[PDB]
Write an enzyme that holds these catalytic residues in place. Structure first.
Site, mmCIF file in Angstrom:
data_model
loop_
_atom_site.group_PDB
_atom_site.id
_atom_site.type_symbol
_atom_site.label_atom_id
_atom_site.label_comp_id
_atom_site.label_asym_id
_atom_site.label_seq_id
_atom_site.Cartn_x
_atom_site.Cartn_y
_atom_site.Cartn_z
ATOM 1 N N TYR A 136 -4.459 2.159 16.062
ATOM 2 C CA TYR A 136 -3.174 2.477 16.693
ATOM 3 C C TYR A 136 -3.457 2.177 18.205
ATOM 4 O O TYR A 136 -2.832 1.448 19.024
ATOM 5 C CB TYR A 136 -2.338 3.438 16.358
ATOM 6 C CG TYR A 136 -1.813 3.564 14.922
ATOM 7 C CD1 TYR A 136 -2.545 4.098 13.794
ATOM 8 C CD2 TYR A 136 -0.697 3.019 14.713
ATOM 9 C CE1 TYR A 136 -2.086 4.235 12.735
ATOM 10 C CE2 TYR A 136 -0.147 2.981 13.254
ATOM 11 C CZ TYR A 136 -0.792 3.535 12.333
ATOM 12 O OH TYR A 136 -0.364 3.800 11.133
ATOM 13 N N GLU A 152 -3.729 0.282 7.984
ATOM 14 C CA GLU A 152 -2.405 0.631 8.747
ATOM 15 C C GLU A 152 -2.758 -0.133 10.040
ATOM 16 O O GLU A 152 -3.712 0.145 10.756
ATOM 17 C CB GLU A 152 -2.591 2.029 8.851
ATOM 18 C CG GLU A 152 -2.140 2.798 7.563
ATOM 19 C CD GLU A 152 -1.942 4.331 7.508
ATOM 20 O OE1 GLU A 152 -1.547 4.734 8.863
ATOM 21 O OE2 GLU A 152 -1.907 4.992 6.657
ATOM 22 N N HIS A 209 -2.910 11.416 0.224
ATOM 23 C CA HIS A 209 -2.279 11.185 1.551
ATOM 24 C C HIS A 209 -1.650 12.454 2.308
ATOM 25 O O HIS A 209 -0.555 12.426 2.537
ATOM 26 C CB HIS A 209 -1.324 9.799 1.286
ATOM 27 C CG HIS A 209 -1.198 9.210 2.862
ATOM 28 N ND1 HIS A 209 -0.638 10.027 3.854
ATOM 29 C CD2 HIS A 209 -1.349 7.986 2.994
ATOM 30 C CE1 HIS A 209 -0.482 8.703 4.911
ATOM 31 N NE2 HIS A 209 -0.912 7.658 4.440
ATOM 32 N N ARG A 253 0.693 -1.265 0.002
ATOM 33 C CA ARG A 253 0.101 0.295 0.037
ATOM 34 C C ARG A 253 0.869 1.375 -0.101
ATOM 35 O O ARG A 253 1.751 1.506 0.835
ATOM 36 C CB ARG A 253 -1.026 -0.044 1.245
ATOM 37 C CG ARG A 253 -1.853 1.297 1.388
ATOM 38 C CD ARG A 253 -2.829 1.098 2.381
ATOM 39 N NE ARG A 253 -3.715 2.526 2.497
ATOM 40 C CZ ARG A 253 -3.659 3.314 3.304
ATOM 41 N NH1 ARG A 253 -2.546 3.241 4.319
ATOM 42 N NH2 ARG A 253 -4.360 4.405 3.388
ATOM 43 N N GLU A 281 -7.166 9.013 5.921
ATOM 44 C CA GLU A 281 -7.416 9.730 7.575
ATOM 45 C C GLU A 281 -7.851 10.970 7.021
ATOM 46 O O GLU A 281 -7.123 11.975 7.324
ATOM 47 C CB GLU A 281 -6.185 9.324 8.253
ATOM 48 C CG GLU A 281 -5.869 8.158 8.559
ATOM 49 C CD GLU A 281 -4.705 7.836 9.668
ATOM 50 O OE1 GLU A 281 -4.279 8.916 10.069
ATOM 51 O OE2 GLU A 281 -4.346 6.940 9.983
ATOM 52 N N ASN A 296 -7.555 2.223 9.820
ATOM 53 C CA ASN A 296 -6.443 2.486 10.574
ATOM 54 C C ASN A 296 -6.564 2.613 12.207
ATOM 55 O O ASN A 296 -7.351 3.430 12.729
ATOM 56 C CB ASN A 296 -5.709 3.558 10.167
ATOM 57 C CG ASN A 296 -5.547 3.812 8.694
ATOM 58 O OD1 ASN A 296 -5.378 2.709 8.092
ATOM 59 N ND2 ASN A 296 -5.008 4.691 8.079
#
Lengths: 451, 452
Positions: free
Chosen positions: A296, A357, A119, A75, A164, A294
């Site tokens: 985290y 991600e 991005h 990606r 995002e 994504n």
């Protein structure tokens, strides 16, 4: 013994401005992060993306590295200013040729290319006349999308519009810690709708050029919000953050309308009736093929009443969730991944998902024996991949997992002080060195099983 | 001016036994429909699929016809007995080579192949030891799926496991008018679960062989059931037929469980605790990429007790001809059923993309002394039903493609060759294909993505 479904995609993810470098070469105009990182006090130690990992010149070695790790997919992002300078006019073939060669190099190694159209690297010329706060930017993103799709539609089976947009909208125009660095609640919310309109108009362009078997998608850093307690005030806090952080994207794109509660929370900061025009939500809510997630760290909120990237909910207090912390001082809690995957499964049972991600930053160093041992990153990945396995077993439709990142990176406002990659990068010499996690993740991508 | 979304797939659909012919050539063992059509009194006029449209030998001309019609895709079936005789053992390469060449011929013309693994042509050797009533058949379908996927996975981007298992289960083992011709409510319901298990096991094999960009799917003739009145007896009738006709597939495949109400309606006819074993529903409910919808006519039901059935447990339900025009099948022409069916799946499963895998009509087609085959009723039918798809799309339905049934006139199962669905007329005496007036109309649709 965590065997994953057949055909599960194993990949790694990068971003254009974070690895490529060559910011001014071959006709690339500066992006908003070129202006931002070159502004004193906006990025730690004044680090910029001028060189970064020099991937523009070393992409062939990196693709060979991807093959060594048994990656099934890769990606990446396409730099808007590198392909189409200034954001208008025709494309520079010299810039297009880089991504043509990158894709061909991936297909030769048997790796599936996954392209992120945007991005956070908006052409500075477009920000100079409004950026995402003005309505012309989505029209520029459409034309830019047509350029890249026409050139790479035959070869790239996965296309992501935006990565995002929460950061682009709120961190870029609300708190001002990212993208152009503006601080204005009205600007941040106009970006929200224009990012949605750009994604929507971008999907319409993709559908008219790419083959029908290819998958369109959008990637969202969906905050997994836990309230500090069951008190109704803490539950409203979780709701507010979910409304302005998450359901401003999930709503219009999947349900075709902005949630009424986020319209109320932010109504005093922007005129939604003039912002949303006739036809916008039809465009924004075009059917998509895949949702990129994504994750985290979880988000812990509480009623704070006793420059913000959450317009209308500045009174919400945030807390560090319990557990271990990465080098980002982010909480390590794999249950947030499971919860986030299960939520989308419960709320949208037919939308396939891919973890686009997932990773962690740690204090990586080369030992005198030439080893880069990061067992904490293996622990993190082993933990979070168990969550995906458990979610899958509970009915979640997860199709792929992408590790952030392939390489150590320019981590935006943190500069190069934070290392997410499975492959260490000595920026002084640009040497690539696989970390201990690279050997562990290569076995996962090869055997479809967790060691 | 009915402008369709960008990238809308325009195609036509056929079935293996209905067009191919060459039933005994190159090692193809007889299927259950070979035995069925060769049984006196099971098919009108004793018609069989021995020759049919002879597509096995004329596929290159047909592909050129597909290109002439500006088709973006082509939906076909793969004959189980032709690829793997008897249903077990290794595959005959001579049979695999036909489908390899067909796909290559399609890819050369730029047409998207859409392969249906099963389309009612079960190997007679498998029916001889239980058929879909026994549990070994789904395992045989898995191995058969592995053969075809390994050979054609690189080239075929759309894969359908089963086409209309309602007919295979209920018309085949309930009313006995199709497939092997058995009449037993318990047999029909054991087929239901084993067809579901076969679809499920087939998806697991496909995922381990096909590229991630390929789309898996199942095709269902979902009955669009309207009650004759609002009386609770008529609403229960509509519910019963929806439970045993539709939600025996939608339930286990999409929701991962059989609905309790269909378990109650049929509990006296089959022991579900012995039929459904541990692990079946996990297999059946594998994530799917696309839902294939076959629609032709609505279903109008009422409780007949109030002023051999293919619906076990609801034999008391009376069926009625919905109002509107009738096709040569005497089926009601009502495009609203298409819209309603699309909207239902949209409301009940908002994330599942859809494709109309079959839609058409039979009419009394004839060659005029001037060599013309004028079928304005079929154009009217298609123009009507394509408007329904258009409005559903406009109302948020995720419809990805439309497939006309059929490309050619074909062996229409128990009706033999007495019913003509194709956009291209076929003179079976000489096997010559002649485009009908609707073929010219549909070719403009497939080329411009607009309705004339």
């Amino acid at each position: 013994s965590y065997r994953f479904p057949p055909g599960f995609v194993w990949g790694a993810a990068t971003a254009a401005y974070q690895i490529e470098g060559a910011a001014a070469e071959d006709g690339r105009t500066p992006s908003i992060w070129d202006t931002f990182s070159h502004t004193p006090g906006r990025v730690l130690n004044g680090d910029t993306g001028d060189i970064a990992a020099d991937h523009y010149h070393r992409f062939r070695d990196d693709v060979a590295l991807m093959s060594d790790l048994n990656l099934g997919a890769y990606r990446f992002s396409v730099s808007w200013s590198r392909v189409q300078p200034t954001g208008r006019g025709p494309a520079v073939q010299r810039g297009l040729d880089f991504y043509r060669q990158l894709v061909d190099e991936l297909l030769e190694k048997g790796i599936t290319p996954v392209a992120t159209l945007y991005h956070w690297d908006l052409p500075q010329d477009l920000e100079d006349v409004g950026g995402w706060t003005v309505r012309d930017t989505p029209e520029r993103f459409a034309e830019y999308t047509e350029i890249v799709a026409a050139a790479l539609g035959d070869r790239v089976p996965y296309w992501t519009t935006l990565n995002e947009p929460w950061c682009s909208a709120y961190l870029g125009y609300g708190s001002g810690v990212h993208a152009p660095g503006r601080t204005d609640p009205e600007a941040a919310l106009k970006a929200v709708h224009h990012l949605n309109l750009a994604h929507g108009r971008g999907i319409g362009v993709l559908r008219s050029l790419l083959p029908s078997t290819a998958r369109t998608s959008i990637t969202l850093n969906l905050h997994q919000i836990r309230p500090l307690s069951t008190s109704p005030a803490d539950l409203d806090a979780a709701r507010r953050i979910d409304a302005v952080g998450n359901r401003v994207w999930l709503g219009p794109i999947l349900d075709g309308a902005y949630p009424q509660d986020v319209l109320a929370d932010t109504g005093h900061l922007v005129d939604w009736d003039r912002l949303v025009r006739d036809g916008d939500l039809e465009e924004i809510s075009r059917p998509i093929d895949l949702l990129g997630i994504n994750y985290y760290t979880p988000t812990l909120v509480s009623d704070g009443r006793a420059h913000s990237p959450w317009p209308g909910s500045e009174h919400v207090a945030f807390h560090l969730a319990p557990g271990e912390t990465t080098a980002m001082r982010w909480a390590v809690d794999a249950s947030g991944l499971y919860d986030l995957l299960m939520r989308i499964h419960r709320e949208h049972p037919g939308l396939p998902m891919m973890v686009t991600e997932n990773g962690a930053a740690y204090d990586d160093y080369i030992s005198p024996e030439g080893a880069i041992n990061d067992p904490d990153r293996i622990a993190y990945l082993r933990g979070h991949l168990s969550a995906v396995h458990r979610a899958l077993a509970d009915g979640a439709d997860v199709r792929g997992y992408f590790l952030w990142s392939l390489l150590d990176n320019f981590e935006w406002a943190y500069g190069y002080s934070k290392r997410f990659g499975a492959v260490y990068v000595d920026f002084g010499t640009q040497r690539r060195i696989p970390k201990q996690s690279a050997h562990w993740y290569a076995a996962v991508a090869r055997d479809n099983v967790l060691p």
